[PDB]
C-alpha cells in the first residue's frame, strides 16, 4: 500500500490561501475551514437540501458547479459538506475549504487529483 498523508500540506495550503486573500475562516477539529457570509431562518444528517454551490481549486479552476438549485440528501455527500451544511439555514451562504481527507481523499477522482484542497461556495436555498 502507498498511503499518503496530506493533512499538514492541506492545512498549510488553506492558511496560505486565507492569508493571500483577506479572509478569516473558522476552523473545526476535523480540519475544515468555513466562512459564513449570511444565514437564514438547520439541516440534519437525514435531510434533503437544495444548493447553488460552486467548487474550485486553490488556483481558481472550477471542477464542479451548479448555477441552479440541485437537491441532495446530505448523507451521501463528502464529509466536508456533511459538517459544513448544517451550520446554516435556508438562504444562508457558506464558503468551505475542504482538505483532501474530507474531500475526495488521497486518490481523488477524474478532474480532481489526490491530495487536493477544495473550495466550495454554497448557498442553501431550501432544507426540504
Amino acid at each position: 500500500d502507498e498511503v499518503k498523508d496530506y493533512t499538514a500540506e492541506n492545512e498549510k495550503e488553506i492558511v496560505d490561501y486565507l492569508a493571500q486573500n483577506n479572509l478569516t475562516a473558522q476552523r473545526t477539529n476535523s480540519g475544515l475551514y468555513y466562512i459564513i457570509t449570511k444565514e437564514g431562518s438547520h439541516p440534519t444528517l437525514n435531510s434533503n437540501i437544495t444548493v447553488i454551490y460552486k467548487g474550485y481549486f486553490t488556483n481558481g479552476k472550477v471542477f464542479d458547479e451548479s448555477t441552479e438549485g440541485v437537491s441532495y440528501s446530505l448523507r451521501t455527500l463528502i464529509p466536508g459538506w456533511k459538517e459544513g451544511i448544517p451550520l446554516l439555514k435556508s438562504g444562508g451562504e457558506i464558503q468551505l475549504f475542504v482538505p483532501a481527507h474530507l474531500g475526495y481523499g488521497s486518490n481523488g477522482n477524474k478532474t480532481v487529483p489526490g491530495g487536493a484542497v477544495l473550495i466550495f461556495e454554497i448557498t442553501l436555498v431550501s432544507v426540504n
Partner: peptide
C-alpha cells in the same frame, strides 16, 4: 481497510 487507507490516507 486497505481501500480505506488508500482513500483516507492514514493522516486521520
Amino acid at each position: 481497510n486497505r481501500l480505506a487507507e488508500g482513500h483516507y490516507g492514514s493522516g486521520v
